[PDB]
Short mmCIF file of C-alpha atoms in Angstrom, two decimals:
data_model
loop_
_atom_site.label_atom_id
_atom_site.label_comp_id
_atom_site.label_asym_id
_atom_site.label_seq_id
_atom_site.Cartn_x
_atom_site.Cartn_y
_atom_site.Cartn_z
CA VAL B 8 0.00 0.00 0.00
CA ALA B 9 2.84 2.42 0.75
CA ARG B 10 4.46 1.75 -2.62
CA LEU B 11 1.11 2.24 -4.35
CA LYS B 12 0.59 5.53 -2.52
CA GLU B 13 4.04 6.61 -3.68
CA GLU B 14 3.40 6.53 -7.44
CA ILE B 15 -0.29 7.41 -7.75
CA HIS B 16 0.34 10.88 -9.21
CA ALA B 17 0.60 9.84 -12.89
CA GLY B 18 -2.86 8.32 -12.95
CA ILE B 19 -4.21 5.39 -10.98
CA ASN B 20 -3.90 2.74 -13.71
CA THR B 21 -0.24 3.49 -14.41
CA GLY B 22 0.31 3.71 -10.67
CA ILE B 23 -1.14 0.25 -10.06
CA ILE B 24 0.85 -1.38 -12.86
CA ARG B 25 4.11 0.27 -11.77
CA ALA B 26 3.55 -0.62 -8.12
CA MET B 27 2.98 -4.21 -9.22
CA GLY B 28 6.07 -4.37 -11.41
CA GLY B 29 8.10 -2.81 -8.62
CA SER B 30 7.01 -4.51 -5.39
CA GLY B 31 4.95 -7.55 -6.35
CA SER B 32 8.18 -9.34 -7.20
CA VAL B 33 9.73 -8.47 -3.83
CA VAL B 34 6.70 -9.48 -1.76
CA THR B 35 6.32 -12.69 -3.75
CA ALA B 36 9.98 -13.62 -3.32
CA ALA B 37 9.81 -13.10 0.44
CA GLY B 38 6.52 -14.96 0.74
CA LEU B 39 7.73 -17.93 -1.29
CA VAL B 40 11.03 -18.23 0.57
CA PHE B 41 9.37 -18.24 3.98
CA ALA B 42 6.44 -20.39 2.84
CA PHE B 43 8.63 -23.21 1.57
CA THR B 44 11.04 -22.95 4.51
CA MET B 45 7.94 -23.63 6.60
CA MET B 46 6.79 -26.41 4.25
CA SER B 47 10.04 -28.30 4.88
CA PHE B 48 8.64 -29.25 8.31
CA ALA B 49 6.22 -31.70 6.69
CA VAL B 50 8.85 -34.46 6.63
CA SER B 51 9.23 -33.97 10.37
CA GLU B 52 8.23 -36.95 12.47
CA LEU B 53 6.38 -34.99 15.16
CA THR B 54 2.82 -34.43 13.99
CA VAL B 55 2.05 -31.17 15.81
CA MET B 56 5.04 -29.32 14.38
CA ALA B 57 4.50 -30.87 10.95
CA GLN B 58 0.88 -29.68 11.09
CA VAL B 59 1.93 -26.15 12.06
CA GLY B 60 4.58 -25.99 9.36
CA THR B 61 2.17 -27.14 6.67
CA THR B 62 -0.63 -24.83 7.82
CA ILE B 63 1.61 -21.77 7.73
CA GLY B 64 3.23 -22.73 4.42
CA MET B 65 -0.08 -23.28 2.65
CA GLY B 66 -1.44 -20.10 4.21
CA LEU B 67 1.39 -17.99 2.86
CA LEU B 68 1.23 -19.65 -0.56
CA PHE B 69 -2.49 -18.91 -0.88
CA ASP B 70 -2.01 -15.40 0.52
CA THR B 71 0.87 -14.43 -1.76
CA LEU B 72 -0.24 -16.03 -5.02
CA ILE B 73 -3.98 -15.24 -5.00
CA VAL B 74 -5.28 -12.92 -2.28
CA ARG B 75 -2.45 -10.39 -2.53
CA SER B 76 -1.44 -10.60 -6.19
CA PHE B 77 -4.89 -10.58 -7.83
CA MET B 78 -7.58 -9.69 -5.31
CA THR B 79 -6.41 -6.52 -3.55
CA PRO B 80 -5.03 -4.71 -6.64
CA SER B 81 -8.24 -5.67 -8.45
CA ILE B 82 -10.35 -4.05 -5.73
CA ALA B 83 -8.14 -0.97 -5.91
CA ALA B 84 -8.43 -0.66 -9.69
CA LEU B 85 -12.17 -1.35 -9.61
CA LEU B 86 -12.96 1.24 -6.93
CA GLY B 87 -10.74 3.73 -8.73
CA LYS B 88 -10.64 7.18 -7.15
CA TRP B 89 -12.81 6.14 -4.19
CA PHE B 90 -9.95 4.04 -2.81
CA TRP B 91 -8.44 7.20 -1.27
CA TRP B 92 -11.51 8.80 0.32
CA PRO B 93 -11.68 11.20 2.21
CA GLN B 94 -8.63 12.43 0.29
CA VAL B 95 -9.45 13.72 -3.20
CA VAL B 96 -7.51 12.17 -6.10
CA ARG B 97 -7.86 12.34 -9.87
CA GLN B 98 -8.30 9.07 -11.72
CA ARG B 99 -5.97 10.38 -14.45
CA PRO B 100 -3.92 13.56 -14.96
CA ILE B 101 -4.60 16.41 -17.38
CA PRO B 102 -3.83 15.23 -20.94
CA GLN B 103 -0.44 16.39 -22.16
CA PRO B 104 0.43 17.58 -25.67
CA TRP B 105 2.03 15.05 -28.00
CA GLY L 29 33.54 -3.76 -5.07
CA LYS L 30 30.98 -5.42 -7.35
CA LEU L 31 28.96 -7.73 -5.10
CA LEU L 32 25.33 -6.54 -5.19
CA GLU L 33 24.46 -6.29 -8.88
CA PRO L 34 21.35 -7.31 -10.86
CA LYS L 35 21.68 -9.88 -13.62
CA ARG L 36 19.27 -11.76 -15.89
CA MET L 37 16.25 -9.69 -14.91
CA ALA L 38 12.98 -11.40 -15.85
CA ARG L 39 10.68 -10.71 -12.86
CA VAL L 40 9.56 -7.09 -13.15
CA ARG L 41 8.62 -7.62 -16.81
CA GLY L 42 6.31 -10.51 -15.95
CA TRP L 43 4.88 -8.60 -13.02
CA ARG L 44 4.19 -5.55 -15.18
CA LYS L 45 2.38 -7.90 -17.55
CA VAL L 46 0.21 -9.22 -14.73
CA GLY L 47 -0.31 -5.59 -13.71
CA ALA L 48 -1.60 -4.82 -17.19
CA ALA L 49 -3.92 -7.81 -16.92
CA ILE L 50 -5.18 -6.77 -13.48
CA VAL L 51 -5.91 -3.15 -14.43
CA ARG L 52 -7.75 -3.78 -17.71
CA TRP L 53 -10.18 -6.52 -16.58
CA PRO L 54 -10.64 -6.23 -12.81
CA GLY L 55 -14.15 -7.66 -12.76
CA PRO L 56 -13.41 -11.16 -14.03
CA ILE L 57 -10.17 -11.52 -12.06
CA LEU L 58 -11.81 -10.33 -8.85
CA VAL L 59 -14.70 -12.76 -9.26
CA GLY L 60 -12.32 -15.63 -9.97
CA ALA L 61 -10.27 -14.89 -6.87
CA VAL L 62 -13.47 -14.67 -4.82
CA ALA L 63 -14.52 -18.03 -6.25
CA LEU L 64 -11.31 -19.66 -5.05
CA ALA L 65 -11.70 -17.97 -1.67
CA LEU L 66 -15.22 -19.42 -1.33
CA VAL L 67 -13.87 -22.85 -2.26
CA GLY L 68 -11.55 -22.36 0.70
CA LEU L 69 -14.15 -21.01 3.12
CA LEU L 70 -16.95 -23.57 2.79
CA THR L 71 -14.93 -26.33 4.48
CA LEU L 72 -14.40 -24.23 7.62
CA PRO L 73 -17.66 -24.69 9.60
CA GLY L 74 -17.07 -28.44 9.91
CA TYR L 75 -13.97 -28.47 12.10
CA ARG L 76 -13.13 -30.55 15.17
CA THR L 77 -10.21 -30.38 17.59
CA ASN L 78 -8.39 -33.03 19.59
CA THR I 25 2.24 15.71 -37.07
CA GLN I 26 2.77 11.97 -37.37
CA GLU I 27 6.42 12.25 -36.34
CA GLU I 28 5.50 13.55 -32.89
CA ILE I 29 3.06 10.66 -32.45
CA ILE I 30 5.87 8.27 -33.40
CA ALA I 31 8.17 9.98 -30.90
CA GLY I 32 5.65 9.64 -28.08
CA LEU I 33 4.97 6.00 -28.87
CA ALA I 34 8.71 5.33 -29.13
CA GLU I 35 9.30 6.76 -25.66
CA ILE I 36 6.43 4.79 -24.15
CA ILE I 37 7.41 1.45 -25.68
CA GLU I 38 11.05 2.04 -24.77
CA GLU I 39 9.76 2.44 -21.22
CA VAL I 40 7.80 -0.82 -21.46
CA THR I 41 10.24 -3.29 -23.04
CA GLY I 42 13.47 -1.39 -23.71
CA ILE I 43 13.65 -0.81 -27.47
CA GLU I 44 15.57 2.32 -28.40
CA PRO I 45 13.42 5.00 -30.09
CA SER I 46 15.73 5.22 -33.11
CA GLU I 47 14.87 1.62 -33.99
CA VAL I 48 11.10 2.18 -34.14
CA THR I 49 9.85 3.03 -37.64
CA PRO I 50 6.33 2.99 -39.12
CA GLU I 51 7.36 0.33 -41.71
CA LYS I 52 7.48 -2.71 -39.42
CA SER I 53 5.05 -4.82 -37.43
CA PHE I 54 4.87 -5.56 -33.70
CA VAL I 55 4.79 -9.30 -33.06
CA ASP I 56 7.06 -10.68 -35.77
CA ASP I 57 9.92 -8.16 -35.48
CA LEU I 58 9.79 -6.36 -32.13
CA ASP I 59 8.59 -9.53 -30.37
CA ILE I 60 5.78 -7.65 -28.67
CA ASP I 61 3.11 -9.83 -27.08
CA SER I 62 -0.58 -9.00 -26.64
CA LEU I 63 -0.45 -8.31 -22.89
CA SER I 64 2.43 -5.95 -23.64
CA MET I 65 0.04 -4.45 -26.18
CA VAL I 66 -2.56 -3.72 -23.52
CA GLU I 67 0.36 -2.35 -21.50
CA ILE I 68 1.14 0.14 -24.26
CA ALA I 69 -2.52 1.01 -24.82
CA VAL I 70 -3.31 1.61 -21.14
CA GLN I 71 -0.19 3.67 -20.54
CA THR I 72 -0.70 5.89 -23.59
CA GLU I 73 -4.38 6.38 -22.79
CA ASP I 74 -3.52 7.35 -19.22
CA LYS I 75 -0.63 9.68 -20.08
CA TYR I 76 -1.92 11.42 -23.23
CA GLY I 77 -5.67 10.77 -22.99
CA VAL I 78 -6.37 8.68 -26.11
CA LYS I 79 -8.74 5.74 -25.60
CA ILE I 80 -8.16 2.70 -27.82
CA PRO I 81 -11.00 0.24 -27.06
CA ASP I 82 -10.60 -3.46 -26.52
CA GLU I 83 -11.34 -5.76 -29.47
CA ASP I 84 -9.58 -3.18 -31.64
CA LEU I 85 -5.91 -3.71 -30.70
CA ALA I 86 -5.66 -6.92 -32.72
CA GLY I 87 -6.96 -4.99 -35.74
CA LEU I 88 -3.66 -3.08 -35.96
CA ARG I 89 -0.32 -4.83 -36.42
CA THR I 90 2.19 -2.16 -37.49
CA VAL I 91 3.45 1.12 -36.06
CA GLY I 92 2.17 2.87 -39.17
CA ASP I 93 -1.27 1.45 -38.43
CA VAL I 94 -1.13 2.75 -34.85
CA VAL I 95 -0.15 6.27 -35.90
CA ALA I 96 -2.81 6.22 -38.62
CA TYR I 97 -5.42 5.24 -36.03
CA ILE I 98 -4.31 7.98 -33.64
CA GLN I 99 -4.20 10.72 -36.28
CA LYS I 100 -7.53 9.65 -37.78
CA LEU I 101 -9.20 10.18 -34.39
#
């Protein structure tokens, strides 16, 4: 959200796509690394710790690959300029000459 | 020296492509993600502990 | 006035994929020479619409395949 807020001045559509290209990769890398490090506990003999490792790993995989990469940016782009209420924002800047 | 350098960049391009996809057609993608979320949620109410 | 359109499009697509503006000419197509996909095409369309305020509707991008076609479409509108 902070990165999105940073680059919202040159329209909201360009802002969303640039925020994706800039920080989606970072968040996904971190999420995947930790998620699989936690999935390595499945081979553990103890069932409670294997269960916890698998729960957390699957949770982060679902969170990073679906909820956070497709669902929240979609809501932002759909709601458009009403994603920053009560602040007032323009959905796209004044057209510039060619 | 030269220790922290980028090489063979192929991540931000793909993620800008998915950004283009997610800005142009938000309706379908949102409904699909909600569909998967509902597939997840419906199993919850039947849950027992030991 | 077409040259300024070409300049603007050259800057935008250089931003997207990294093709130098000098290389872009209106006598060559997108997919078979520049290796420009279709999602990169919606990239270009969205960015140019947002920055310079020209709306190219969906189900019309595939109808144009060359830079000359794009500039013709822009300057016809």
